[PDB]
Amino acid sequence: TGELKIECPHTIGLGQGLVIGSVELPPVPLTQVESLKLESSCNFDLHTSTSSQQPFTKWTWEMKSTSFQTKSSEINLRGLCLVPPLVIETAARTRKTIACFDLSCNQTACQPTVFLIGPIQTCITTKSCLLGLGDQRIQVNYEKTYCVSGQLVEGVCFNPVHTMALSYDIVTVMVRCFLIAKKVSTGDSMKLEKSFETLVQKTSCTGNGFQGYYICLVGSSSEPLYIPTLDDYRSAEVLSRMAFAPHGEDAMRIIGKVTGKAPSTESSDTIQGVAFSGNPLYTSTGVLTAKDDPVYIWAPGIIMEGNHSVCDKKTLPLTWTGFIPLPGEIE
Amino acid sequence: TGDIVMTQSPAFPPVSLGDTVTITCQASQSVYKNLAWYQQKPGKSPRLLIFGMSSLADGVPSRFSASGSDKQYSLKIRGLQPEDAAIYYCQQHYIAPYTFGAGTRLEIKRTDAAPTVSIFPPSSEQLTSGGASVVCFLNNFYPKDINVKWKIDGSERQNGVLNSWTDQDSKDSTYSMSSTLTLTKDEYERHNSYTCEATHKTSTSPIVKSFNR
Amino acid sequence: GQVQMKESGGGLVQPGKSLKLSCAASGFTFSDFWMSWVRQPSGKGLEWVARINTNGDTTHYTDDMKGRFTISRDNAKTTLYLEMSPLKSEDTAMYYCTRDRLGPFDYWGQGTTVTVSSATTKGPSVYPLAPGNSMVTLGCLVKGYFPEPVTVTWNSGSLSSGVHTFPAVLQSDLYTLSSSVTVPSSTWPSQTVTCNVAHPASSTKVDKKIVP
Amino acid sequence: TDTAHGSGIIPMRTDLELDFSLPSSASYTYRRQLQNPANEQEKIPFHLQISKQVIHAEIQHLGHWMDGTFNLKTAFHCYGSCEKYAYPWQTAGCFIEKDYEYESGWGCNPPDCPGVGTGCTACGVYLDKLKSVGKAFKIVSLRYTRKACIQLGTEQTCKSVDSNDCLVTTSVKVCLIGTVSKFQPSDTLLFLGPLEQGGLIFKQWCTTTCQFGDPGDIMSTPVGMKCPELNGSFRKKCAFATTPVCQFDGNTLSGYKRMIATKDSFQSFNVTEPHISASSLEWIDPDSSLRDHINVIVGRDLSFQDLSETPCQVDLATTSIDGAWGSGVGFNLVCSVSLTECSTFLTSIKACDSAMCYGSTTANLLRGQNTVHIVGKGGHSGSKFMCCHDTKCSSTGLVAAADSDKIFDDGAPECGISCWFT
Ligand SMILES: *[C@@H]1O[C@H](CO)[C@@H](O[C@@H]2O[C@H](CO)[C@@H](O[C@@H]3O[C@H](CO)[C@@H](O)[C@H](O[C@H]4O[C@H](CO)[C@@H](O)[C@H](O)[C@@H]4O)[C@@H]3O)[C@H](O)[C@H]2NC(C)=O)[C@H](O)[C@H]1NC(C)=O
Ligand SMILES: *[C@@H]1O[C@H](CO)[C@@H](O[C@@H]2O[C@H](CO)[C@@H](O)[C@H](O)[C@H]2NC(C)=O)[C@H](O)[C@H]1NC(C)=O
Ligand SMILES: *[C@@H]1O[C@H](CO)[C@@H](O)[C@H](O)[C@H]1NC(C)=O
């Protein structure tokens, strides 16, 4: 039994906050990954979006005798954290709970990371409940916070700044973000990879057309944070940490550079990365930055290219976990 | 006056490049930690090196350090470079008035170099003024002990000559000297040949460079 | 970002006239530090002169200049001033405006020269030095100027390598110095080497092309 | 109705010199009555009020202290060189990489790559979860100031006495000469939270050669990040027919973790009324760990004739009481002090009874009515507390039923054993 801890605040407050928790489970063989279904015995209202079938290009490597053979094909996965637009943003109002997983994989095995997001009211209704994923049971524990006004962060009770203007103590908090595909008809407002390129590039990249955004939750509970929100200091912070740690923040053995075709029907290579063996470390899921219409990739045993300074064959991860410093008061 | 005196010993013998050096600064009274070290390159402005007797100033290389006991402090430099060959001062700021020191100048010890001598005749623009001036340059030599001598048609001339010397270079640790023999047009039109001789320890034979009129 | 301080207002004054020095500072909060003036004679040690606090209600001076020097500041323009009473011959030095940290001085400016003498300004004369191989050298003579200093550059100052500006010599109220430059024989007289001389007091600006 | 609760009368046959050692968070109140040696009935008041110590420290902003987590990864390649490919640790905030370029033998080789001297084994140590934990400042210079006020006869003079200054008048001189300080230059003050919570003092704060675990290893300077090196060495652990993993036998805990572990081994300090700017840090030390040496001297040429014409008249009356006479409860007395024939007059009022005086309060009275509060502790059941000046007291008093960081020295003769347990 794994443990997914939810830190519950003393009050609901302004209504629009969500609780979030997550746990990384033990390795399962690859052949079992396509069968994985999240089950819930919990007394909450599961959003059905994530358990539908979702098309991915599977990209894999084998030793050959540069010394690699890669290949790819299109498959359907279910239960992954591909959250539709507005679902997280309006979950406090709809009273919907999002439960989904990401995959961190080597060639032969995957560690699912289960994410649970939902309304703060769940803390009134629920002390503990169970999720299942394949053969693993997950104990969700809702636990009331030691603090009076904030959250337990690095063993310290902390409340961040709230005002919209400019004016403190500084505490480093966890941020968890989910990639959302969202197109507009006209212009470049949703061209997410262009935002990264302005932050970390010298010269002009021609074709990074992916349209979407990240939706993030800060700490154990917060209102959703949209990335990018141009004049928000927290958005700026998350983007900068993404730009320097594109596979998130926290033995794996690097083998070499690999390329491949995504989707597999492409005549030439559209993706690159670094093949590895040993313990999976980063998530193995992302989207090509080059296509407006998302091309989703699952690349077990390969760290797909996420360096924003590169122009071609790069990706954005489906989920991203890191840390940002927040100004506020320790109490 | 009842002020504190900061004894800074000048006239430090030259030291080789890349070695470790240490300059001392003695005080007439214990100031305990209120000591600052400064660096004044030749021609440039002073520069704060170390404050608080142990704290490096911003923009100072990591090869600098300072310490000291009661009224006896030191400044240590490890891995000498040709740049940091200048004058160093120590200032106490414990009790008013905040006084400075005397100053200690370093000297990098390099290999002996031969001087690049050159002579220049008076220009046509200077002849309009009524006087003449012969210039003789001696650049990029070591050590600083050098001698110059002027010859007019073989005869010795040791009056009306104005010469100056430059400090040690911050790039190759060499010295230079410029001598100028000033005369009038009435006297310049009487003689034909002018010679500029130099005597340096790099060669017992004096180097000669002359020109005719 | 970067800290930059420049002095101005110096020159030559008669022995018994007044003079006010200015100093413009930038790159830091001027209204949060103590300011101070420190002068240094020709080839002598440093000498603290005055000190002012943030607003300007507390000013420290030396026991020598009893009411002769007056330090002031303007936080609106980030400027430091030093008004001087009728001076004497013992005040001829170079004055620096420093950022006093209640003790040590952590930043020094360029420094301006103040001369207190009964002499008159004299205009310099720039004379080129033509050769008379492998590495040719050229000269530029600045004769008969007063007072110090002068500025000598080569081709708008983009010849810092191989340059040698020599200290001037005083000959009965008339200075004179010379500069030496070294360029390869393939550049001269293939390219136009120009000597630039500037004298602030006499408002002199001479650019001479060195030709055989 | 007056009572013998006067101040210490001092005949001015010789000069009056005094030495003081004021604590850091202490305010002194020394008052006497200087007597003319030619007339017993000619006395002038002398009051000396010294405030607390104000510490002014010109500091250098070191920046923010960062806390991170240790992580190690290994990257293996069969052909090529180590300086040919990229690694995920090279793009982190702080990273140190040691690679075994061209050192591919056969005992450390995996089941793949049957080659010798052609592979590459890179090892990367990086730090993640970088979050600020405190702010650090470095002391450049120190300055101590105290505000002093004197009251001699009818004259009143105040000044902020520095170390290089003295309050000098025609008859009184107050100088500040020495200061024993807990702080000294080149010290590093670290504030974990806000200013009022205090901080810690570090002497060996690393500046040039910082290592992971030292105080000040990871710093968030305004120019950018300043990452340290590691305290340890790398090694390649490998088995037969397995990919060579990379080990690091060194320090894993960060500088903040070790500081939290041995926090009790560092010097602590508190601050009160802090004022920090881009160049200074002013505060009053409440721990009373600093001592100031003050020299006061009053000449005997006081000219008692000039300081006697039109003295300062003071009338008072007790108007309110609140508290208890028990030793520990305390009481608060309200006095209506009326100052006449003087614009401003610095004195002090005491809450006295038939025998003793259980409290005092120094105030600079203005011409007219003045409300003065006096705190007191002690007294008996039938104690009728009254307001009192030097000698004159109020007409009536009040009775009750059922430290402050001030020092009072008026030279009054205290009651003996007759006032103990009665
Ligand atoms: C992808 O990642 C997975 C998970 O990280 C990884 O598979 C695992 O590998 C380990 C070690 O390689 C396996 O561990 C074994 O566990 C059994 C359980 O009883 C042990 O008995 C075994 O012990 C023997 O082997 C050791 C060899 O060094 C000896 O030290 C020991 O004394 C015993 O002789 C053994 O350690 C583990 O079972 C798998 N896990 C799964 C989920 O299959 C996999 O290697 C990674 N894939 C790649 C291609 O890198
Ligand atoms: C991210 O991508 C850029 C571009 O490929 C890499 O930048 C190059 O890095 C090498 C070695 O650090 C330098 O010699 C080049 O000059 C860089 N080129 C450019 C255009 O910046 C960068 O190293 C990559 N980051 C990684 C792999 O972490
Ligand atoms: C700071 O104040 C606290 C208050 O309880 C006290 O315990 C502590 O000793 C003080 N610090 C010092 C250095 O005295």
Numbering used by the authors:
A (entry chain B): 27 to 91, 102 to 203, 209 to 291, 301 to 381
B (entry chain L): -1 to 211
C (entry chain H): 0 to 131, 137 to 216
D (entry chain A): 668 to 1069, 1082 to 1101
Question: Can you quote the paper on this entry?
Answer:
Following the validation that PUUV VLP presents a glycoprotein architecture that accurately resembles the native virion, we applied an identical cryo-ET approach to VLPs treated with Fab P-4G2. The data were split in two sets: (i) spikes that were part of a lattice, and (ii) spikes in regions of incomplete lattice. The former yielded a reconstruction similar to the VLP sample prepared without the Fab, while the reconstruction focused on lattice-free spikes yielded a discrete (Gn−Gc)4 spike with additional density. Fitting of the crystal structure of Fab P-4G2−PUUV Gc complex and PUUV Gn into the reconstruction of the Fab-treated (Gn−Gc)4 spike confirms that the additional density is comprised of Fab P-4G2. PUUV GcGc−P-4G2 fits well within the cryo-ET reconstruction, where the crystallographically observed conformation of domain III accurately matches a feature of the glycoprotein spike, further supporting that PUUV Gc has crystallized in the pre-fusion conformation presented on the mature virion. The fitting locates domain III of the Gc adjacent to the membrane, allowing the transmembrane region of the C-terminus to be linked to the virion envelope, and places the fusion loop from Gc domain II into membrane-distal lobe density in close contact with Gn, in a manner similar to that observed for other class II fusion proteins and their cognate accessory proteins. The goodness of fit supports the hypothesis that domain III has crystallized in a conformation that closely resembles the pre-fusion state presented in the mature hantaviral spike. When combined with a cryo-ET reconstruction of Fab P-4G2 complexed with PUUV (Gn−Gc)4 spike, our analysis reveals that mAb P-4G2 targets a pre-fusion, lattice-free conformation of PUUV Gc. In our cryo-ET reconstruction, Fab P-4G2 was found to bind PUUV Gc only in the lattice-free state, and the frequency of lattice-free spikes was higher in the presence of Fab P-4G2.
Entry of a hantavirus into a host cell is negotiated by two membrane-anchored glycoproteins, Gn and Gc, which form a lattice decorating the lipid bilayer envelope of the mature virion. The Gc adopts a three-domain (domains I−III) class II fusion protein architecture and is postulated to associate closely with the Gn, linking adjacent Gn tetramers. Here we structurally characterize the epitope of mAb P-4G2, a potently neutralizing antibody derived following experimental infection of bank voles with Puumala virus (PUUV), a hantavirus responsible for one of the most frequently occurring hantaviral diseases, a mild form of HFRS known as nephropathia epidemica (NE).
